[PDB]
Please model this.
Amino acid sequence: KETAAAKFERQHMDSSTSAASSSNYCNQMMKSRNLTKDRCKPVNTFVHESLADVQAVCSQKNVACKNGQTNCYQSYSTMSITDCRETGSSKYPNCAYKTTQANKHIIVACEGNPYVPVHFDASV
Model:
């Protein structure tokens, strides 16, 4: 089955580009990452930095996770991200998202070998 690390890459990594410039970014990304297949995933963040730079976060500021586990890490630096949030009138299968670019610190849970992100906890 899909590993946690691999799901994290599917749901949260978009190195391709430096920013979600266009306002259809979310509708197209959420669909192509299989997050609109059975239902519209309501909220999701994409990170536009190199996989290497994101994985390096697992060596930065150790913070608690939302769930209480102590294997979360906050990026020292801000990173280019895109917040995708389903509109109030979106209805499956026609999943509609608002696309919002930002530069914020990411907080991720990290586990395994190699020790890499397996959950997106928040941006701050």
